Amino acid sequence: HHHHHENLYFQGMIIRYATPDDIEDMVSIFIDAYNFPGPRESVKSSFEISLEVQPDGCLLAFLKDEPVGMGCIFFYNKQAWIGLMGVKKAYQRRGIGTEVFRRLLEIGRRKVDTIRLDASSQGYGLYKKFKFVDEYRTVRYELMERPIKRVEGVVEVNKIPNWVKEIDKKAFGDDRIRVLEAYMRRGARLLCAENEGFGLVYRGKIGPLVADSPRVAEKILLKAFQLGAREIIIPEVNKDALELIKIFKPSQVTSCMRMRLGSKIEEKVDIYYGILAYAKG
């Protein structure tokens, strides 16, 4: 004997837990992998939030100090979400994403019995190899025009009330309040109608949007648009959500297929109009 390596061998690469010192690299991987033409700071702030939500959730793949690939797992009580998968285009299609995902699953299986995600066209085939099954599509729409229609009765609140925690638990099927909180530390606005619905507005995005009726969801969405919301990701199985957004003359941006490994989570998707993020569920 001679050389002593205390990790599995995988193509001469190093895969390890990310820390906040790795934010710039994560951002670079993401912008490469997703061909993101937007401003950098946008991604940096999003990833700072992700590491607050799950400090030990991010795996990074390195080929000799060059950052090549990443992915994340976010834990709730009954399920975890895998999101933010990305391998730099020069390094794609040689098994790196598959390996990062394997490792994430390994971590997830010890803690929870259901793992879910929102799959793009490139990812879909990877996740299917691990026996992920289709749930329903989650469709990203851009809201183009302001409806000529006033609303009254929607307020922004600085602390999450218990009734919001309860209606979100019902919509999502789990506890993700720490995610809402992390976004609100960065300026995200919590809009509430009556005690029957809420929406979270962060940058140009509303998510989640949860409402006991289409009329309450509409009130929130109109006020969100006024506060700069231009995008919403709708679960395609909420029949009222697609009809709701039509008054904004929406433009479809992209869709994913939500997928699951393990047992179905009881969720109330009829009240669930806008998912939080493809990364988080």
Ligand SMILES: CC(C)(COP(=O)(O)OP(=O)(O)OC[C@H]1O[C@@H](n2cnc3c(N)ncnc32)[C@H](O)[C@@H]1OP(=O)(O)O)[C@H](O)C(=O)NCCC(=O)NCCS
């Ligand atoms: C999904 C992604 C992370 C895959 O990473 P990767 O290192 O290239 O994937 P792997 O080499 O391990 O390939 C695993 C499987 O992914 C799927 N895949 C990867 N790239 C693909 C693409 N270009 N088109 C269709 N399927 C693709 C295939 O099923 C592949 O298996 P195969 O080679 O036997 O057919 C992806 O290429 C990426 O970083 N893009 C980012 C944005 C995106 O569209 N996907 C992430 C969100 S779900």
